[PDB]
Amino acid sequence: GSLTEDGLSYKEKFVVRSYEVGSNKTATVETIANLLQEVGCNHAQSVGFSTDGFATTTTMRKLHLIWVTARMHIEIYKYPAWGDVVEIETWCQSEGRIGTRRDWILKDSVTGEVTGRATSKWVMMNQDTRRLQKVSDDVRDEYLVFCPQEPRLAFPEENNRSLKKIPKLEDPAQYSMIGLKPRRADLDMNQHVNNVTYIGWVLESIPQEIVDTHELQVITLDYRRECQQDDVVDSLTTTTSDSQFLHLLRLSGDGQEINRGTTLWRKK
Amino acid sequence: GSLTEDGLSYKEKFVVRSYEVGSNKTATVETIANLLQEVGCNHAQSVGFSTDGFATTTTMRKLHLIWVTARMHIEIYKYPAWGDVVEIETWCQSEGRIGTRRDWILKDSVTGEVTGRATSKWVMMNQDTRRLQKVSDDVRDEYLVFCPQEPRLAFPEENNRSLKKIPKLEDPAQYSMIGLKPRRADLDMNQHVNNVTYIGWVLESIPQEIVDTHELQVITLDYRRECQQDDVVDSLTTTTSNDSQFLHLLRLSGDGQEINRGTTLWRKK
Ligand SMILES: Cc1noc(C)c1C(=O)NCCC1=CCCCC1
Ligand SMILES: Cc1noc(C)c1C(=O)NCCC1=CCCCC1
């Protein structure tokens, strides 16, 4: 992997591993999501930001400020097979005082064809109080020198799937998976649950028949609250429709929301 | 990755990924175990065996026979850091009519120093009845051409940890983690739970204080029964011991049917 010629984006190649594939002999969506966070981390390191998952600058660390994912949107046209070479390109951009955006383009290295794309919105917050801040001015300058100044959107379409409001699932849910817990493998260097684990938890309430007759095409997820090491999650799914579903992750007892999303599935 | 000059072993290099590390900023044991299974699969493919996790030959598929892990033994001296390059060498060997053995050597590519080693015993079995059978001569000849004919042991020692009998944990267990379930990410191409998930489940009943003051040095695990997609596991641990040793047991949540038993040796950090 390396920053491109202009230094305003990063590229990296991956060979799909034997343990990274599911029932269709193709990469799981959790493998794809892990590959996205890997190239995003390598881009953060190549420009001097932190590599702890928060992509902080010098002044952000001085003020105990971090970047947190608020929303994610992934669209996959073709899942890579075992042994395939995928090329991922990533870049970040300023969204005024609202926050940051990180985009990804996935391509098959042999054909150069776009096989997937992703977008994510990030917000600035105090690491201890968790209170959101509007992006100041001294922070915008420390990281805008690494962003293209002209807009560069992985999903350029005027008001598309990545910018639609997600509603709260109403009880009773059609499908559910209860008592989900993260294990040590799901935790990062600072013992926080990996962002990709929440994707897997959402998909656990999808029935096995849908998974065996359909492929996941689009996934939009809102991150409301962080799940701790000792927290237990309930995964809820209801059909809204191709096949579409509405999702909800909440804490096992009290029912405190952690995530809500939508999935669009295509027949095999 | 590629088979070595003599074709009797396989090597592959890996760069440790950001999401593959834990609290120490070093690779988790599940990442190490996944890297071992990856190079083992690439070696199976390089010599024409199946790549479904069973490493079957033509005649084995004709008779519905598969290789299954019976025991695993891993020793780690130094866990690789984020961005480090590790080199893994693997080879398999005939253990007469008992089964096969697969060995691994982990090295830091920059220093060439041995940072870890692993061994595993495999047994032949009918895929459907799950009945273990002695390895026949037809099968023995189809894979012996890929094994070194002289012994090559990752753990050559005359009385080492990889060949010690593991006892069954007696209730009450000192520590426990209940209601563990595999997710879709933990399943292979044929919807079987990945062998590395069982390692992670064993380590879930280790207290967080041990994990934060010690590093895992040795892990020996016996695989008695396969956990299904819809099965729920209970993880049990009791201290047996500068070092700390534990006895482990994985069993089904209800009835308590054993799936695994093992031992871990931890060194002060
Ligand atoms: C920048 C940066 N610095 O460290 C990391 C790690 C990144 C990064 O790109 N993380 C993406 C997080 C994510 C991926 C897939 C699921 C939804 C959330
Ligand atoms: C040969 C072969 N062919 O496909 C695969 C996959 C292998 C392989 O080496 N699997 C190792 C299994 C394992 C890994 C970590 C500890 C527990 C047991």
Side-chain angles (χ1 to χ4, degrees), chain A residues 8 15 24 27 45 69 77 97-98 101 120 165-167 188 191 193 196 200 211 218 246 261 264 268:
Chain A
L8 299 174
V15 167
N24 18 35
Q45 210 245 217
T69 307
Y77 312 115
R97 321 271 295 221
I98 303 174
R101 208 189 69 250
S120 67
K165 198 66 195 72
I166 315 162
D188 74 0
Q191 272 152 250
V193 173
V196 181
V211 186
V218 183
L246 186 59
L264 176 69
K268 287 180 188 185

mmCIF file of all heavy atoms in Angstrom, chain A residues 8 15 24 27 45 69 77 97-98 101 120 165-167 188 191 193 196 200 211 218 246 261 264 268:
data_model
loop_
_atom_site.group_PDB
_atom_site.id
_atom_site.type_symbol
_atom_site.label_atom_id
_atom_site.label_comp_id
_atom_site.label_asym_id
_atom_site.label_seq_id
_atom_site.Cartn_x
_atom_site.Cartn_y
_atom_site.Cartn_z
ATOM 1 N N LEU A 8 -3.301 12.804 -2.093
ATOM 2 C CA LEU A 8 -4.624 13.102 -1.552
ATOM 3 C C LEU A 8 -5.557 11.887 -1.411
ATOM 4 O O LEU A 8 -6.745 12.067 -1.108
ATOM 5 C CB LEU A 8 -5.300 14.212 -2.352
ATOM 6 C CG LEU A 8 -4.569 15.547 -2.345
ATOM 7 C CD1 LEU A 8 -5.240 16.515 -3.264
ATOM 8 C CD2 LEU A 8 -4.460 16.120 -0.927
ATOM 9 N N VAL A 15 -5.030 -10.058 -0.882
ATOM 10 C CA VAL A 15 -5.329 -11.367 -1.472
ATOM 11 C C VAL A 15 -6.294 -12.003 -0.484
ATOM 12 O O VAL A 15 -5.951 -12.095 0.692
ATOM 13 C CB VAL A 15 -4.073 -12.247 -1.674
ATOM 14 C CG1 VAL A 15 -4.462 -13.682 -1.980
ATOM 15 C CG2 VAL A 15 -3.182 -11.689 -2.775
ATOM 16 N N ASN A 24 -20.529 -19.238 0.073
ATOM 17 C CA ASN A 24 -20.426 -19.088 -1.383
ATOM 18 C C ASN A 24 -18.980 -19.091 -1.907
ATOM 19 O O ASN A 24 -18.768 -18.763 -3.076
ATOM 20 C CB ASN A 24 -21.192 -17.835 -1.892
ATOM 21 C CG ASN A 24 -21.536 -16.775 -0.847
ATOM 22 O OD1 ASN A 24 -20.778 -16.527 0.112
ATOM 23 N ND2 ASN A 24 -22.687 -16.119 -1.015
ATOM 24 N N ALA A 27 -15.717 -13.728 -0.105
ATOM 25 C CA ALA A 27 -15.483 -12.964 1.111
ATOM 26 C C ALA A 27 -16.763 -12.606 1.846
ATOM 27 O O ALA A 27 -17.763 -12.255 1.221
ATOM 28 C CB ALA A 27 -14.705 -11.693 0.787
ATOM 29 N N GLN A 45 -1.823 6.546 9.070
ATOM 30 C CA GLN A 45 -0.420 6.446 9.431
ATOM 31 C C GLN A 45 0.484 7.138 8.421
ATOM 32 O O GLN A 45 1.470 7.760 8.806
ATOM 33 C CB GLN A 45 0.013 4.987 9.569
ATOM 34 C CG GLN A 45 1.135 4.858 10.584
ATOM 35 C CD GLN A 45 2.457 4.411 10.042
ATOM 36 O OE1 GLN A 45 3.173 3.652 10.704
ATOM 37 N NE2 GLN A 45 2.821 4.878 8.847
ATOM 38 N N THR A 69 -17.239 7.133 14.185
ATOM 39 C CA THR A 69 -18.154 6.874 13.071
ATOM 40 C C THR A 69 -19.605 7.116 13.524
ATOM 41 O O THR A 69 -20.037 6.574 14.531
ATOM 42 C CB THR A 69 -18.061 5.406 12.575
ATOM 43 O OG1 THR A 69 -16.712 5.051 12.277
ATOM 44 C CG2 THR A 69 -18.952 5.133 11.368
ATOM 45 N N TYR A 77 -21.115 -5.044 -5.467
ATOM 46 C CA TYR A 77 -21.621 -5.603 -6.729
ATOM 47 C C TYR A 77 -21.142 -7.029 -6.946
ATOM 48 O O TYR A 77 -21.867 -7.847 -7.506
ATOM 49 C CB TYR A 77 -21.177 -4.740 -7.921
ATOM 50 C CG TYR A 77 -21.432 -3.277 -7.653
ATOM 51 C CD1 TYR A 77 -20.379 -2.378 -7.539
ATOM 52 C CD2 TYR A 77 -22.706 -2.821 -7.355
ATOM 53 C CE1 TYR A 77 -20.601 -1.046 -7.211
ATOM 54 C CE2 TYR A 77 -22.942 -1.491 -7.055
ATOM 55 C CZ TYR A 77 -21.885 -0.610 -6.960
ATOM 56 O OH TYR A 77 -22.125 0.692 -6.613
ATOM 57 N N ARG A 97 -18.332 22.273 9.465
ATOM 58 C CA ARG A 97 -18.257 22.132 10.921
ATOM 59 C C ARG A 97 -18.992 20.871 11.420
ATOM 60 O O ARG A 97 -18.985 20.611 12.620
ATOM 61 C CB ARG A 97 -18.813 23.393 11.619
ATOM 62 C CG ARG A 97 -18.450 24.716 10.940
ATOM 63 C CD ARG A 97 -17.146 25.269 11.444
ATOM 64 N NE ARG A 97 -17.237 25.637 12.859
ATOM 65 C CZ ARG A 97 -16.709 26.741 13.383
ATOM 66 N NH1 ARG A 97 -16.020 27.585 12.618
ATOM 67 N NH2 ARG A 97 -16.841 26.995 14.680
ATOM 68 N N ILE A 98 -19.610 20.081 10.513
ATOM 69 C CA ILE A 98 -20.352 18.878 10.877
ATOM 70 C C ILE A 98 -19.399 17.749 11.263
ATOM 71 O O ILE A 98 -19.608 17.084 12.277
ATOM 72 C CB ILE A 98 -21.309 18.480 9.720
ATOM 73 C CG1 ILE A 98 -22.275 19.640 9.388
ATOM 74 C CG2 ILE A 98 -22.069 17.196 10.044
ATOM 75 C CD1 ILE A 98 -23.149 19.402 8.193
ATOM 76 N N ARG A 101 -15.774 12.860 6.387
ATOM 77 C CA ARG A 101 -16.332 11.800 5.572
ATOM 78 C C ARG A 101 -15.156 10.934 5.061
ATOM 79 O O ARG A 101 -14.120 11.485 4.692
ATOM 80 C CB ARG A 101 -17.118 12.395 4.399
ATOM 81 C CG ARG A 101 -18.242 11.513 3.892
ATOM 82 C CD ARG A 101 -18.849 12.029 2.597
ATOM 83 N NE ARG A 101 -17.919 11.893 1.474
ATOM 84 C CZ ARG A 101 -17.323 12.908 0.859
ATOM 85 N NH1 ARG A 101 -17.581 14.155 1.223
ATOM 86 N NH2 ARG A 101 -16.477 12.682 -0.134
ATOM 87 N N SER A 120 -18.681 6.902 4.786
ATOM 88 C CA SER A 120 -18.878 6.957 6.232
ATOM 89 C C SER A 120 -18.779 8.372 6.727
ATOM 90 O O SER A 120 -17.940 9.113 6.245
ATOM 91 C CB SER A 120 -17.887 6.057 6.966
ATOM 92 O OG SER A 120 -16.547 6.507 6.848
ATOM 93 N N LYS A 165 -33.036 8.895 5.793
ATOM 94 C CA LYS A 165 -33.274 8.738 7.234
ATOM 95 C C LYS A 165 -33.735 7.312 7.638
ATOM 96 O O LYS A 165 -34.642 6.762 7.007
ATOM 97 C CB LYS A 165 -34.249 9.803 7.751
ATOM 98 C CG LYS A 165 -34.193 9.957 9.269
ATOM 99 C CD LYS A 165 -32.846 10.518 9.721
ATOM 100 C CE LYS A 165 -32.596 10.357 11.200
ATOM 101 N NZ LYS A 165 -32.321 8.930 11.548
ATOM 102 N N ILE A 166 -33.097 6.708 8.671
ATOM 103 C CA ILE A 166 -33.450 5.357 9.133
ATOM 104 C C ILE A 166 -34.428 5.392 10.309
ATOM 105 O O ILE A 166 -34.116 5.942 11.361
ATOM 106 C CB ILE A 166 -32.201 4.493 9.477
ATOM 107 C CG1 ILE A 166 -31.102 4.615 8.400
ATOM 108 C CG2 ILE A 166 -32.596 3.033 9.735
ATOM 109 C CD1 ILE A 166 -29.723 4.173 8.855
ATOM 110 N N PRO A 167 -35.602 4.764 10.160
ATOM 111 C CA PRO A 167 -36.574 4.762 11.268
ATOM 112 C C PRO A 167 -36.302 3.723 12.361
ATOM 113 O O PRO A 167 -35.576 2.758 12.137
ATOM 114 C CB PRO A 167 -37.912 4.515 10.570
ATOM 115 C CG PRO A 167 -37.582 3.942 9.239
ATOM 116 C CD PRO A 167 -36.119 4.079 8.961
ATOM 117 N N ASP A 188 -10.260 -3.805 20.220
ATOM 118 C CA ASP A 188 -9.092 -3.130 19.662
ATOM 119 C C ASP A 188 -7.959 -2.952 20.725
ATOM 120 O O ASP A 188 -8.038 -3.569 21.788
ATOM 121 C CB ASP A 188 -9.531 -1.812 18.982
ATOM 122 C CG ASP A 188 -9.905 -0.678 19.923
ATOM 123 O OD1 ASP A 188 -9.832 -0.876 21.154
ATOM 124 O OD2 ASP A 188 -10.261 0.410 19.426
ATOM 125 N N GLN A 191 -9.308 -1.701 24.137
ATOM 126 C CA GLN A 191 -10.395 -2.568 24.594
ATOM 127 C C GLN A 191 -11.803 -2.106 24.170
ATOM 128 O O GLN A 191 -12.791 -2.448 24.820
ATOM 129 C CB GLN A 191 -10.316 -2.826 26.101
ATOM 130 C CG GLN A 191 -9.442 -4.028 26.410
ATOM 131 C CD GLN A 191 -8.778 -3.981 27.764
ATOM 132 O OE1 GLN A 191 -7.552 -3.821 27.876
ATOM 133 N NE2 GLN A 191 -9.563 -4.135 28.826
ATOM 134 N N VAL A 193 -14.943 -2.283 21.411
ATOM 135 C CA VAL A 193 -15.475 -3.219 20.423
ATOM 136 C C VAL A 193 -15.272 -2.626 19.019
ATOM 137 O O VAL A 193 -15.572 -1.446 18.788
ATOM 138 C CB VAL A 193 -16.953 -3.559 20.708
ATOM 139 C CG1 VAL A 193 -17.560 -4.397 19.591
ATOM 140 C CG2 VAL A 193 -17.086 -4.266 22.045
ATOM 141 N N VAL A 196 -16.709 -3.239 13.043
ATOM 142 C CA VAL A 196 -17.150 -4.317 12.147
ATOM 143 C C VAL A 196 -17.988 -5.370 12.882
ATOM 144 O O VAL A 196 -18.853 -5.997 12.268
ATOM 145 C CB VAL A 196 -15.952 -4.957 11.394
ATOM 146 C CG1 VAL A 196 -16.418 -6.062 10.448
ATOM 147 C CG2 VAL A 196 -15.162 -3.896 10.634
ATOM 148 N N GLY A 200 -21.752 -7.441 11.917
ATOM 149 C CA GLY A 200 -22.008 -8.867 12.051
ATOM 150 C C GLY A 200 -23.190 -9.156 12.944
ATOM 151 O O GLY A 200 -23.966 -10.067 12.666
ATOM 152 N N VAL A 211 -30.019 -15.730 3.593
ATOM 153 C CA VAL A 211 -28.577 -15.788 3.382
ATOM 154 C C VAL A 211 -28.194 -16.831 2.320
ATOM 155 O O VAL A 211 -27.249 -16.617 1.568
ATOM 156 C CB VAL A 211 -27.838 -16.043 4.722
ATOM 157 C CG1 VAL A 211 -26.336 -15.961 4.544
ATOM 158 C CG2 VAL A 211 -28.286 -15.055 5.782
ATOM 159 N N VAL A 218 -26.590 -3.903 -0.340
ATOM 160 C CA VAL A 218 -26.437 -2.592 0.286
ATOM 161 C C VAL A 218 -26.676 -2.738 1.790
ATOM 162 O O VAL A 218 -27.551 -3.495 2.204
ATOM 163 C CB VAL A 218 -27.451 -1.555 -0.301
ATOM 164 C CG1 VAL A 218 -27.241 -0.159 0.298
ATOM 165 C CG2 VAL A 218 -27.419 -1.506 -1.831
ATOM 166 N N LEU A 246 -35.336 -3.772 8.006
ATOM 167 C CA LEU A 246 -35.062 -2.698 8.958
ATOM 168 C C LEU A 246 -34.411 -3.393 10.183
ATOM 169 O O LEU A 246 -34.838 -4.485 10.579
ATOM 170 C CB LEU A 246 -36.353 -1.978 9.350
ATOM 171 C CG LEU A 246 -36.215 -0.735 10.236
ATOM 172 C CD1 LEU A 246 -35.348 0.333 9.570
ATOM 173 C CD2 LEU A 246 -37.605 -0.164 10.596
ATOM 174 N N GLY A 261 -30.256 0.134 11.247
ATOM 175 C CA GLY A 261 -29.854 0.104 9.851
ATOM 176 C C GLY A 261 -30.862 -0.490 8.903
ATOM 177 O O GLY A 261 -31.985 -0.804 9.293
ATOM 178 N N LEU A 264 -30.358 -4.348 1.831
ATOM 179 C CA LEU A 264 -31.022 -4.660 0.582
ATOM 180 C C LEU A 264 -30.327 -5.902 0.022
ATOM 181 O O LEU A 264 -29.100 -5.938 -0.088
ATOM 182 C CB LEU A 264 -30.961 -3.469 -0.385
ATOM 183 C CG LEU A 264 -31.553 -3.711 -1.773
ATOM 184 C CD1 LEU A 264 -33.054 -3.858 -1.727
ATOM 185 C CD2 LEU A 264 -31.167 -2.605 -2.718
ATOM 186 N N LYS A 268 -29.976 -14.786 -5.809
ATOM 187 C CA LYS A 268 -28.750 -15.360 -6.387
ATOM 188 C C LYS A 268 -28.870 -15.728 -7.875
ATOM 189 O O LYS A 268 -27.938 -15.488 -8.654
ATOM 190 C CB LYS A 268 -28.247 -16.561 -5.563
ATOM 191 C CG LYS A 268 -27.620 -16.172 -4.221
ATOM 192 C CD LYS A 268 -27.128 -17.387 -3.428
ATOM 193 C CE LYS A 268 -26.688 -16.994 -2.032
ATOM 194 N NZ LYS A 268 -26.085 -18.117 -1.257
#
